Amino acid sequence: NSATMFGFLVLGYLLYLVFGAVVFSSVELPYEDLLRQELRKLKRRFLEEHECLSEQQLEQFLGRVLEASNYGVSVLWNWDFTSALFFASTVLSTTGYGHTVPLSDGGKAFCIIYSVIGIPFTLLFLTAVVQRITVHVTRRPVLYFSKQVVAIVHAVLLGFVTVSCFFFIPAAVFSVLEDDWNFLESFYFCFISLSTIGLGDYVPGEGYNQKFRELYKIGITCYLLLGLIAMLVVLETFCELHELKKFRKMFY
Amino acid sequence: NSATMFGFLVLGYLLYLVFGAVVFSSVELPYEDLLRQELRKLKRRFLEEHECLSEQQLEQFLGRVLEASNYGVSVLWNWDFTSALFFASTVLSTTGYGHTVPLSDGGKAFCIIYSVIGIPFTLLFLTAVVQRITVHVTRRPVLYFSKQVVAIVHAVLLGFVTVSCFFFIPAAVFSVLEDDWNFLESFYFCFISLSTIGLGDYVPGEGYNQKFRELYKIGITCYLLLGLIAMLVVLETFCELHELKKFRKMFY
Numbered sequence A, B: 001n002s003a004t005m006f007g008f009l010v011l012g013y014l015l016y017l018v019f020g021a022v023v024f025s026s027v028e029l030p031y032e033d034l035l036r037q038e039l040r041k042l043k044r045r046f047l048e049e050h051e052c053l054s055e056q057q058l059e060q061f062l063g064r065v066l067e068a069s070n071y072g073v074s075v076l077w078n079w080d081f082t083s084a085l086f087f088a089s090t091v092l093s094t095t096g097y098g099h100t101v102p103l104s105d106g107g108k109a110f111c112i113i114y115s116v117i118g119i120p121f122t123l124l125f126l127t128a129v130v131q132r133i134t135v136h137v138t139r140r141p142v143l144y145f146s147k148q149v150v151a152i153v154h155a156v157l158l159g160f161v162t163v164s165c166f167f168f169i170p171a172a173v174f175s176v177l178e179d180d181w182n183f184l185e186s187f188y189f190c191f192i193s194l195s196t197i198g199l200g201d202y203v204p205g206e207g208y209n210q211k212f213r214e215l216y217k218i219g220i221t222c223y224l225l226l227g228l229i230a231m232l233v234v235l236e237t238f239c240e241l242h243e244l245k246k247f248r249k250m251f252y
Protein backbone atom coordinates (compact mmCIF):
# COMPACT_ATOMS: atom_id res chain seq x y z
CA ASN A 1 0.00 0.00 0.00
CA SER A 2 3.04 2.22 0.59
CA ALA A 3 3.76 1.89 -3.13
CA THR A 4 0.54 3.66 -4.08
CA MET A 5 1.35 6.47 -1.67
CA PHE A 6 4.71 7.35 -3.23
CA GLY A 7 3.26 6.51 -6.64
CA PHE A 8 0.54 9.12 -6.15
CA LEU A 9 2.94 11.67 -4.74
CA VAL A 10 5.03 11.35 -7.89
CA LEU A 11 1.91 11.69 -9.98
CA GLY A 12 0.38 14.65 -8.15
CA TYR A 13 3.65 16.52 -8.18
CA LEU A 14 3.93 16.19 -11.97
CA LEU A 15 0.39 17.45 -12.26
CA TYR A 16 1.02 20.35 -9.90
CA LEU A 17 3.79 21.25 -12.40
CA VAL A 18 1.46 21.06 -15.36
CA PHE A 19 -1.22 22.83 -13.42
CA GLY A 20 1.02 25.78 -12.71
CA ALA A 21 2.57 25.56 -16.17
CA VAL A 22 -0.91 26.25 -17.47
CA VAL A 23 -2.03 28.92 -15.01
CA PHE A 24 1.22 30.81 -15.66
CA SER A 25 0.99 30.19 -19.40
CA SER A 26 -2.36 31.93 -19.63
CA VAL A 27 -2.06 34.81 -17.18
CA GLU A 28 1.43 35.86 -18.10
CA LEU A 29 1.36 35.19 -21.85
CA PRO A 30 -1.05 38.09 -22.73
CA TYR A 31 1.11 40.72 -21.07
CA GLU A 32 3.91 39.41 -23.17
CA ASP A 33 2.12 39.80 -26.57
CA LEU A 34 1.22 43.32 -25.59
CA LEU A 35 4.79 43.97 -24.44
CA ARG A 36 6.18 42.44 -27.61
CA GLN A 37 4.12 45.09 -29.42
CA GLU A 38 5.04 48.09 -27.28
CA LEU A 39 8.64 47.12 -28.16
CA ARG A 40 8.25 46.33 -31.87
CA LYS A 41 6.31 49.61 -32.04
CA LEU A 42 8.94 51.60 -30.08
CA LYS A 43 11.61 49.90 -32.18
CA ARG A 44 10.16 51.04 -35.54
CA ARG A 45 9.39 54.54 -34.25
CA PHE A 46 12.92 55.04 -32.87
CA LEU A 47 14.84 54.44 -36.07
CA GLU A 48 12.24 55.91 -38.43
CA GLU A 49 11.35 58.61 -35.91
CA HIS A 50 14.71 60.22 -35.31
CA GLU A 51 17.46 58.83 -37.44
CA CYS A 52 20.35 60.97 -36.03
CA LEU A 53 19.06 61.46 -32.41
CA SER A 54 21.41 62.78 -29.67
CA GLU A 55 22.86 61.49 -26.37
CA GLN A 56 19.55 62.34 -24.66
CA GLN A 57 17.49 60.55 -27.34
CA LEU A 58 19.47 57.25 -27.12
CA GLU A 59 19.42 56.87 -23.32
CA GLN A 60 15.63 57.11 -23.61
CA PHE A 61 15.34 54.27 -26.16
CA LEU A 62 17.96 52.05 -24.56
CA GLY A 63 16.28 52.59 -21.23
CA ARG A 64 12.96 51.16 -22.46
CA VAL A 65 14.85 48.37 -24.26
CA LEU A 66 16.90 47.25 -21.26
CA GLU A 67 13.84 47.48 -19.00
CA ALA A 68 12.16 44.96 -21.35
CA SER A 69 15.23 42.77 -21.24
CA ASN A 70 15.20 42.48 -17.46
CA TYR A 71 11.67 41.15 -17.81
CA GLY A 72 12.47 38.44 -20.33
CA VAL A 73 11.40 40.26 -23.47
CA SER A 74 14.16 41.32 -25.85
CA VAL A 75 13.75 43.94 -28.51
CA LEU A 76 15.78 41.93 -31.03
CA TRP A 77 8.51 33.08 -26.56
CA ASN A 78 8.65 33.00 -22.70
CA TRP A 79 5.24 31.88 -21.56
CA ASP A 80 4.06 29.09 -23.83
CA PHE A 81 3.29 25.95 -21.90
CA THR A 82 6.38 24.03 -22.79
CA SER A 83 8.41 26.95 -21.41
CA ALA A 84 5.94 27.85 -18.66
CA LEU A 85 6.32 24.29 -17.45
CA PHE A 86 10.07 24.94 -17.46
CA PHE A 87 9.48 27.97 -15.27
CA ALA A 88 7.10 26.29 -12.83
CA SER A 89 9.61 23.50 -12.19
CA THR A 90 12.69 25.73 -11.78
CA VAL A 91 10.70 27.85 -9.37
CA LEU A 92 9.81 24.91 -7.12
CA SER A 93 13.27 23.32 -7.35
CA THR A 94 14.13 26.92 -6.56
CA THR A 95 16.67 27.49 -9.29
CA GLY A 96 15.08 30.67 -10.75
CA TYR A 97 17.10 31.55 -13.81
CA GLY A 98 15.03 34.66 -14.39
CA HIS A 99 15.19 34.51 -18.16
CA THR A 100 11.47 34.39 -17.50
CA VAL A 101 9.91 36.26 -14.62
CA PRO A 102 6.22 36.88 -14.03
CA LEU A 103 5.13 40.21 -15.46
CA SER A 104 1.67 41.04 -14.16
CA ASP A 105 0.86 41.21 -10.49
CA GLY A 106 -1.27 38.13 -10.73
CA GLY A 107 1.67 36.20 -12.07
CA LYS A 108 3.90 37.58 -9.36
CA ALA A 109 1.31 36.80 -6.71
CA PHE A 110 0.20 33.41 -8.09
CA CYS A 111 3.86 32.55 -8.22
CA ILE A 112 4.20 33.28 -4.52
CA ILE A 113 1.22 31.14 -3.49
CA TYR A 114 2.01 28.47 -6.04
CA SER A 115 5.40 28.28 -4.39
CA VAL A 116 4.36 28.35 -0.73
CA ILE A 117 2.44 25.23 -1.61
CA GLY A 118 4.79 23.79 -4.24
CA ILE A 119 8.18 24.29 -2.62
CA PRO A 120 7.14 22.04 0.33
CA PHE A 121 5.24 19.65 -1.90
CA THR A 122 8.55 19.51 -3.82
CA LEU A 123 10.54 18.61 -0.74
CA LEU A 124 8.22 15.76 0.13
CA PHE A 125 8.38 14.62 -3.48
CA LEU A 126 12.16 14.66 -3.45
CA THR A 127 12.42 13.16 0.01
CA ALA A 128 10.46 10.14 -1.14
CA VAL A 129 12.16 9.81 -4.51
CA VAL A 130 15.51 10.02 -2.77
CA GLN A 131 14.85 7.87 0.30
CA ARG A 132 13.91 5.13 -2.11
CA ILE A 133 16.72 5.61 -4.61
CA THR A 134 19.16 6.07 -1.69
CA VAL A 135 18.30 2.67 -0.33
CA HIS A 136 18.45 0.76 -3.63
CA VAL A 137 21.80 2.44 -4.40
CA THR A 138 23.04 2.15 -0.80
CA ARG A 139 21.79 -1.34 0.19
CA ARG A 140 24.84 -2.53 -1.68
CA PRO A 141 27.39 -1.30 0.92
CA VAL A 142 25.85 -4.18 2.86
CA LEU A 143 26.13 -6.83 0.06
CA TYR A 144 29.76 -5.95 0.69
CA PHE A 145 29.83 -5.84 4.52
CA SER A 146 34.91 -4.58 6.22
CA LYS A 147 31.85 -2.35 6.93
CA GLN A 148 32.70 1.34 7.35
CA VAL A 149 35.19 1.17 4.53
CA VAL A 150 32.68 -0.35 2.13
CA ALA A 151 30.72 2.89 2.43
CA ILE A 152 33.62 5.33 2.09
CA VAL A 153 34.40 3.54 -1.15
CA HIS A 154 30.75 3.25 -2.24
CA ALA A 155 30.37 6.98 -1.77
CA VAL A 156 33.55 8.17 -3.51
CA LEU A 157 32.75 5.71 -6.30
CA LEU A 158 29.14 6.82 -6.63
CA GLY A 159 30.30 10.42 -6.72
CA PHE A 160 32.67 9.84 -9.62
CA VAL A 161 29.72 8.07 -11.35
CA THR A 162 27.05 10.76 -11.30
CA VAL A 163 29.56 13.62 -11.51
CA SER A 164 30.42 12.15 -14.89
CA CYS A 165 26.98 10.86 -15.68
CA PHE A 166 25.13 14.12 -14.89
CA PHE A 167 27.72 16.84 -15.49
CA PHE A 168 30.21 15.70 -18.11
CA ILE A 169 27.82 13.73 -20.27
CA PRO A 170 25.28 16.59 -20.34
CA ALA A 171 28.06 19.19 -20.26
CA ALA A 172 28.97 17.69 -23.60
CA VAL A 173 25.37 17.23 -24.80
CA PHE A 174 24.87 20.94 -24.33
CA SER A 175 28.20 21.86 -25.96
CA VAL A 176 26.36 20.20 -28.80
CA LEU A 177 22.81 21.48 -28.53
CA GLU A 178 23.82 25.04 -27.56
CA ASP A 179 26.01 26.72 -30.16
CA ASP A 180 27.79 29.55 -28.35
CA TRP A 181 28.36 27.27 -25.36
CA ASN A 182 31.75 25.63 -25.13
CA PHE A 183 32.35 22.79 -22.70
CA LEU A 184 33.27 24.86 -19.67
CA GLU A 185 30.18 26.98 -20.24
CA SER A 186 27.99 23.91 -20.64
CA PHE A 187 29.58 22.30 -17.61
CA TYR A 188 29.46 25.55 -15.65
CA PHE A 189 25.76 25.77 -16.46
CA CYS A 190 25.10 22.30 -15.13
CA PHE A 191 26.86 23.04 -11.89
CA ILE A 192 24.92 26.21 -11.08
CA SER A 193 21.73 24.47 -12.27
CA LEU A 194 21.92 21.29 -10.27
CA SER A 195 23.14 23.28 -7.29
CA THR A 196 19.92 25.31 -7.69
CA ILE A 197 21.96 28.52 -7.71
CA GLY A 198 20.59 29.47 -11.12
CA LEU A 199 22.43 32.66 -11.94
CA GLY A 200 20.79 32.50 -15.37
CA ASP A 201 23.72 33.86 -17.35
CA TYR A 202 23.23 30.65 -19.39
CA VAL A 203 19.90 28.94 -20.08
CA PRO A 204 19.50 26.20 -22.64
CA GLY A 205 17.00 26.35 -25.45
CA GLU A 206 17.19 30.02 -26.19
CA GLY A 207 18.99 30.36 -29.51
CA TYR A 208 17.88 32.32 -32.59
CA ASN A 209 16.03 29.69 -34.63
CA GLN A 210 15.90 26.60 -32.36
CA LYS A 211 14.01 23.64 -33.85
CA PHE A 212 11.85 21.26 -31.81
CA ARG A 213 12.43 23.71 -28.95
CA GLU A 214 9.18 22.73 -27.27
CA LEU A 215 10.71 19.38 -26.34
CA TYR A 216 14.18 20.65 -25.57
CA LYS A 217 12.40 22.53 -22.78
CA ILE A 218 10.60 19.43 -21.54
CA GLY A 219 13.87 17.58 -21.81
CA ILE A 220 15.75 20.15 -19.78
CA THR A 221 13.00 20.29 -17.18
CA CYS A 222 13.73 16.60 -16.70
CA TYR A 223 17.47 16.85 -16.85
CA LEU A 224 17.35 19.38 -14.07
CA LEU A 225 14.76 17.50 -12.07
CA LEU A 226 16.60 14.14 -12.17
CA GLY A 227 20.02 15.67 -11.69
CA LEU A 228 18.78 17.24 -8.49
CA ILE A 229 17.49 13.92 -7.22
CA ALA A 230 20.86 12.47 -8.16
CA MET A 231 22.70 15.09 -6.22
CA LEU A 232 20.56 14.63 -3.12
CA VAL A 233 20.99 10.88 -3.46
CA VAL A 234 24.75 11.37 -3.48
CA LEU A 235 24.44 13.87 -0.69
CA GLU A 236 22.57 11.48 1.59
CA THR A 237 25.07 8.77 0.76
CA PHE A 238 27.80 11.11 1.89
CA CYS A 239 25.97 12.73 4.82
CA GLU A 240 25.54 9.20 6.20
CA LEU A 241 29.14 8.02 6.46
CA HIS A 242 30.35 7.52 10.02
CA GLU A 243 33.08 10.12 9.86
CA LEU A 244 30.58 12.74 8.70
CA LYS A 245 27.84 12.11 11.26
CA LYS A 246 30.81 12.46 13.59
CA PHE A 247 32.02 15.77 12.20
CA ARG A 248 28.46 17.10 12.01
CA LYS A 249 27.42 16.02 15.48
CA MET A 250 30.49 17.88 16.66
CA PHE A 251 28.56 21.18 16.61
CA TYR A 252 25.13 20.79 18.33
CA ASN B 1 34.03 22.84 24.45
CA SER B 2 31.11 22.38 22.04
CA ALA B 3 30.63 26.15 22.22
CA THR B 4 34.02 26.82 20.65
CA MET B 5 33.22 24.37 17.85
CA PHE B 6 30.05 26.13 16.69
CA GLY B 7 31.68 29.46 17.54
CA PHE B 8 34.53 28.69 15.14
CA LEU B 9 32.21 27.36 12.47
CA VAL B 10 30.31 30.66 12.53
CA LEU B 11 33.60 32.51 12.37
CA GLY B 12 35.19 30.48 9.57
CA TYR B 13 32.07 30.67 7.48
CA LEU B 14 32.03 34.47 7.68
CA LEU B 15 35.65 34.48 6.66
CA TYR B 16 35.05 32.07 3.79
CA LEU B 17 32.53 34.72 2.63
CA VAL B 18 35.06 37.53 2.90
CA PHE B 19 37.72 35.35 1.38
CA GLY B 20 35.60 34.68 -1.70
CA ALA B 21 34.29 38.25 -1.70
CA VAL B 22 37.90 39.28 -2.18
CA VAL B 23 39.04 36.66 -4.70
CA PHE B 24 35.97 37.47 -6.83
CA SER B 25 36.41 41.20 -6.30
CA SER B 26 39.87 41.15 -7.82
CA VAL B 27 39.60 38.62 -10.64
CA GLU B 28 36.26 39.74 -11.96
CA LEU B 29 36.55 43.49 -11.38
CA PRO B 30 39.20 44.11 -14.13
CA TYR B 31 37.12 42.51 -16.87
CA GLU B 32 34.38 44.85 -15.82
CA ASP B 33 36.43 48.09 -16.18
CA LEU B 34 37.50 46.93 -19.60
CA LEU B 35 33.90 46.01 -20.45
CA ARG B 36 32.63 49.31 -19.12
CA GLN B 37 34.99 50.89 -21.67
CA GLU B 38 34.12 48.71 -24.66
CA LEU B 39 30.54 49.87 -23.99
CA ARG B 40 31.13 53.57 -23.27
CA LYS B 41 33.30 53.49 -26.42
CA LEU B 42 30.68 51.65 -28.53
CA LYS B 43 28.05 53.98 -27.08
CA ARG B 44 29.80 57.19 -28.22
CA ARG B 45 30.71 55.72 -31.60
CA PHE B 46 27.15 54.58 -32.31
CA LEU B 47 25.41 57.92 -31.94
CA GLU B 48 28.26 60.04 -33.30
CA GLU B 49 29.16 57.37 -35.84
CA HIS B 50 25.88 56.94 -37.67
CA GLU B 51 23.19 59.32 -36.55
CA CYS B 52 20.37 58.03 -38.84
CA LEU B 53 21.43 54.31 -39.12
CA SER B 54 18.98 51.69 -40.52
CA GLU B 55 17.23 48.54 -39.24
CA GLN B 56 20.46 46.58 -39.80
CA GLN B 57 22.58 49.17 -37.95
CA LEU B 58 20.38 49.21 -34.79
CA GLU B 59 20.14 45.44 -34.30
CA GLN B 60 23.93 45.46 -34.28
CA PHE B 61 24.22 48.08 -31.51
CA LEU B 62 21.34 46.75 -29.43
CA GLY B 63 22.81 43.29 -29.76
CA ARG B 64 26.11 44.34 -28.13
CA VAL B 65 24.16 46.36 -25.52
CA LEU B 66 21.85 43.54 -24.46
CA GLU B 67 24.75 41.07 -24.42
CA ALA B 68 26.43 43.39 -21.86
CA SER B 69 23.20 43.57 -19.88
CA ASN B 70 22.96 39.79 -19.48
CA TYR B 71 26.40 39.96 -17.93
CA GLY B 72 25.61 42.63 -15.36
CA VAL B 73 27.01 45.61 -17.19
CA SER B 74 24.51 48.14 -18.50
CA VAL B 75 25.27 50.68 -21.17
CA LEU B 76 23.29 53.40 -19.39
CA TRP B 77 29.63 48.76 -9.92
CA ASN B 78 29.21 44.92 -9.73
CA TRP B 79 32.43 43.58 -8.34
CA ASP B 80 33.57 45.87 -5.55
CA PHE B 81 34.02 44.00 -2.32
CA THR B 82 30.86 45.17 -0.63
CA SER B 83 28.95 43.82 -3.64
CA ALA B 84 31.27 40.89 -4.28
CA LEU B 85 30.57 39.82 -0.74
CA PHE B 86 26.89 40.07 -1.64
CA PHE B 87 27.52 37.73 -4.54
CA ALA B 88 29.61 35.20 -2.64
CA SER B 89 26.87 34.84 -0.02
CA THR B 90 23.94 34.56 -2.44
CA VAL B 91 25.89 31.95 -4.33
CA LEU B 92 26.43 29.75 -1.28
CA SER B 93 22.90 30.26 0.06
CA THR B 94 22.24 29.41 -3.57
CA THR B 95 19.93 32.29 -4.38
CA GLY B 96 21.83 33.52 -7.49
CA TYR B 97 20.09 36.67 -8.61
CA GLY B 98 22.38 37.00 -11.59
CA HIS B 99 22.49 40.78 -11.55
CA THR B 100 26.14 39.87 -11.17
CA VAL B 101 27.59 36.82 -12.84
CA PRO B 102 31.27 35.95 -13.19
CA LEU B 103 32.68 37.22 -16.48
CA SER B 104 36.11 35.65 -16.99
CA ASP B 105 36.66 31.93 -17.03
CA GLY B 106 38.60 32.15 -13.80
CA GLY B 107 35.63 33.73 -12.11
CA LYS B 108 33.31 31.12 -13.58
CA ALA B 109 35.66 28.34 -12.54
CA PHE B 110 36.62 29.76 -9.13
CA CYS B 111 32.93 30.18 -8.51
CA ILE B 112 32.39 26.49 -9.16
CA ILE B 113 35.13 25.32 -6.78
CA TYR B 114 34.34 28.01 -4.24
CA SER B 115 30.84 26.60 -4.25
CA VAL B 116 31.63 22.89 -4.14
CA ILE B 117 33.40 23.73 -0.92
CA GLY B 118 31.15 26.57 0.26
CA ILE B 119 27.69 25.16 -0.40
CA PRO B 120 28.38 22.22 2.00
CA PHE B 121 30.25 24.41 4.45
CA THR B 122 27.08 26.54 4.29
CA LEU B 123 24.83 23.65 5.14
CA LEU B 124 26.89 22.71 8.17
CA PHE B 125 26.91 26.37 9.19
CA LEU B 126 23.15 26.59 8.88
CA THR B 127 22.54 23.21 10.47
CA ALA B 128 24.37 24.33 13.59
CA VAL B 129 22.89 27.83 13.69
CA VAL B 130 19.45 26.31 13.31
CA GLN B 131 19.75 23.28 15.59
CA ARG B 132 20.67 25.71 18.31
CA ILE B 133 18.07 28.37 17.56
CA THR B 134 15.48 25.61 17.04
CA VAL B 135 16.01 24.32 20.51
CA HIS B 136 15.96 27.68 22.31
CA VAL B 137 12.80 28.62 20.36
CA THR B 138 11.30 25.12 20.69
CA ARG B 139 12.24 24.18 24.28
CA ARG B 140 9.25 26.28 25.21
CA PRO B 141 6.61 23.83 23.90
CA VAL B 142 7.82 21.88 26.93
CA LEU B 143 7.56 24.78 29.45
CA TYR B 144 3.96 24.37 28.35
CA PHE B 145 3.62 20.56 28.36
CA SER B 146 -1.46 19.16 26.80
CA LYS B 147 1.68 18.16 24.81
CA GLN B 148 1.05 17.68 21.08
CA VAL B 149 -1.24 20.66 21.00
CA VAL B 150 1.32 22.94 22.61
CA ALA B 151 3.47 22.39 19.52
CA ILE B 152 0.76 22.85 16.88
CA VAL B 153 0.11 26.18 18.52
CA HIS B 154 3.79 27.03 19.02
CA ALA B 155 4.38 26.42 15.34
CA VAL B 156 1.42 28.32 13.90
CA LEU B 157 2.25 31.13 16.31
CA LEU B 158 5.93 31.19 15.44
CA GLY B 159 5.04 31.24 11.77
CA PHE B 160 2.84 34.29 12.12
CA VAL B 161 5.77 35.88 14.01
CA THR B 162 8.61 35.56 11.51
CA VAL B 163 6.32 35.85 8.48
CA SER B 164 5.60 39.32 9.79
CA CYS B 165 8.99 39.93 11.28
CA PHE B 166 10.99 38.90 8.19
CA PHE B 167 8.64 39.57 5.27
CA PHE B 168 6.28 42.39 6.18
CA ILE B 169 8.67 44.44 8.23
CA PRO B 170 11.39 44.25 5.55
CA ALA B 171 8.78 44.28 2.78
CA ALA B 172 8.02 47.72 4.11
CA VAL B 173 11.66 48.70 4.79
CA PHE B 174 12.36 48.06 1.12
CA SER B 175 9.22 49.87 -0.08
CA VAL B 176 11.15 52.63 1.63
CA LEU B 177 14.76 52.09 0.61
CA GLU B 178 13.91 51.06 -3.00
CA ASP B 179 12.02 53.74 -4.89
CA ASP B 180 10.32 51.97 -7.77
CA TRP B 181 9.41 49.09 -5.46
CA ASN B 182 5.89 49.16 -4.05
CA PHE B 183 4.93 46.87 -1.20
CA LEU B 184 3.94 43.84 -3.22
CA GLU B 185 7.21 44.13 -5.14
CA SER B 186 9.21 44.49 -1.95
CA PHE B 187 7.31 41.62 -0.34
CA TYR B 188 7.50 39.55 -3.53
CA PHE B 189 11.26 40.09 -3.51
CA CYS B 190 11.57 38.85 0.03
CA PHE B 191 9.66 35.72 -0.73
CA ILE B 192 11.75 34.65 -3.74
CA SER B 193 14.88 35.69 -1.82
CA LEU B 194 14.35 33.81 1.40
CA SER B 195 13.07 30.86 -0.58
CA THR B 196 16.43 30.98 -2.40
CA ILE B 197 14.62 31.03 -5.73
CA GLY B 198 16.28 34.30 -6.69
CA LEU B 199 14.73 35.14 -10.03
CA GLY B 200 16.59 38.45 -9.86
CA ASP B 201 13.91 40.58 -11.47
CA TYR B 202 14.31 42.68 -8.30
CA VAL B 203 17.55 43.20 -6.39
CA PRO B 204 17.94 45.82 -3.70
CA GLY B 205 20.65 48.45 -3.77
CA GLU B 206 20.75 49.07 -7.46
CA GLY B 207 19.21 52.49 -8.04
CA TYR B 208 20.65 55.41 -10.00
CA ASN B 209 22.47 57.44 -7.30
CA GLN B 210 22.23 55.26 -4.14
CA LYS B 211 24.02 56.72 -1.10
CA PHE B 212 25.87 54.62 1.48
CA ARG B 213 25.25 51.72 -0.91
CA GLU B 214 28.32 49.86 0.33
CA LEU B 215 26.51 49.15 3.60
CA TYR B 216 23.07 48.58 2.11
CA LYS B 217 24.78 45.62 0.46
CA ILE B 218 26.28 44.35 3.70
CA GLY B 219 22.92 44.91 5.32
CA ILE B 220 21.07 42.92 2.69
CA THR B 221 23.63 40.15 2.80
CA CYS B 222 22.64 39.84 6.44
CA TYR B 223 18.94 40.23 5.93
CA LEU B 224 19.02 37.37 3.50
CA LEU B 225 21.35 35.27 5.63
CA LEU B 226 19.30 35.60 8.84
CA GLY B 227 15.95 35.31 7.09
CA LEU B 228 17.08 31.97 5.70
CA ILE B 229 18.05 30.73 9.15
CA ALA B 230 14.67 31.96 10.34
CA MET B 231 12.88 30.04 7.65
CA LEU B 232 14.76 26.83 8.35
CA VAL B 233 14.09 27.33 12.05
CA VAL B 234 10.39 27.60 11.28
CA LEU B 235 10.69 24.71 8.91
CA GLU B 236 12.22 22.39 11.48
CA THR B 237 9.60 23.49 14.00
CA PHE B 238 6.96 22.44 11.52
CA CYS B 239 8.68 19.34 10.11
CA GLU B 240 8.79 18.06 13.71
CA LEU B 241 5.10 18.09 14.64
CA HIS B 242 3.62 14.64 15.16
CA GLU B 243 1.09 14.90 12.38
CA LEU B 244 3.83 15.79 9.90
CA LYS B 245 6.34 13.07 10.80
CA LYS B 246 3.23 10.95 10.32
CA PHE B 247 2.35 12.29 6.88
CA ARG B 248 6.00 12.21 5.79
CA LYS B 249 6.73 8.70 7.05
CA MET B 250 3.71 7.65 5.01
CA PHE B 251 5.86 7.47 1.87
CA TYR B 252 9.12 5.55 2.54
Ligand SMILES: CCCCCCCCCCC
Binding pocket: A194, A195, A196, A231, A232, A235, B116, B119
Ligand atom coordinates in the same frame (compact mmCIF):
# COMPACT_ATOMS: atom_id res chain seq x y z
C1 LIG C 1 17.10 22.08 -1.80
C2 LIG C 1 18.60 22.10 -1.48
C3 LIG C 1 19.45 21.44 -2.58
C4 LIG C 1 20.96 21.50 -2.33
C5 LIG C 1 21.77 20.78 -3.42
C6 LIG C 1 23.25 20.71 -3.04
C7 LIG C 1 24.10 20.01 -4.11
C8 LIG C 1 25.58 20.25 -3.82
C9 LIG C 1 26.52 19.47 -4.75
C10 LIG C 1 27.97 19.75 -4.37
C11 LIG C 1 28.94 18.81 -5.10
Ligand SMILES: CCCCCCCCCCC
Binding pocket: A116, A119, B194, B195, B196, B231, B232
Ligand atom coordinates in the same frame (compact mmCIF):
# COMPACT_ATOMS: atom_id res chain seq x y z
C1 LIG D 1 18.60 25.10 1.12
C2 LIG D 1 17.09 24.85 1.06
C3 LIG D 1 16.27 26.02 1.61
C4 LIG D 1 14.76 25.85 1.50
C5 LIG D 1 13.98 27.04 2.06
C6 LIG D 1 12.48 26.75 2.07
C7 LIG D 1 11.66 27.90 2.65
C8 LIG D 1 10.18 27.66 2.36
C9 LIG D 1 9.26 28.73 2.97
C10 LIG D 1 7.80 28.41 2.65
C11 LIG D 1 6.82 29.25 3.48
Ligand SMILES: [K+]
Binding pocket: A094, A095, A096, A196, A197, A198, B094, B095, B096, B196, B197, B198
Ligand atom coordinates in the same frame (compact mmCIF):
# COMPACT_ATOMS: atom_id res chain seq x y z
K1 LIG E 1 18.29 29.82 -6.80
Ligand SMILES: [K+]
Binding pocket: A096, A097, A098, A198, A199, A200, B096, B097, B098, B198, B199, B200
Ligand atom coordinates in the same frame (compact mmCIF):
# COMPACT_ATOMS: atom_id res chain seq x y z
K1 LIG F 1 18.60 34.59 -11.70
Ligand SMILES: [K+]
Binding pocket: A095, A096, A097, A098, A196, A197, A198, A199, A200, B095, B096, B097, B098, B197, B198, B199, B200
Ligand atom coordinates in the same frame (compact mmCIF):
# COMPACT_ATOMS: atom_id res chain seq x y z
K1 LIG G 1 18.47 32.13 -9.20
Ligand SMILES: [K+]
Binding pocket: A097, A098, A099, A199, A200, B097, B098, B099, B199, B200
Ligand atom coordinates in the same frame (compact mmCIF):
# COMPACT_ATOMS: atom_id res chain seq x y z
K1 LIG H 1 18.96 37.82 -15.14
Ligand SMILES: [K+]
Binding pocket: A093, A094, A095, A195, A196, A197, B093, B094, B095, B195, B196, B197
Ligand atom coordinates in the same frame (compact mmCIF):
# COMPACT_ATOMS: atom_id res chain seq x y z
K1 LIG I 1 18.10 27.32 -4.20
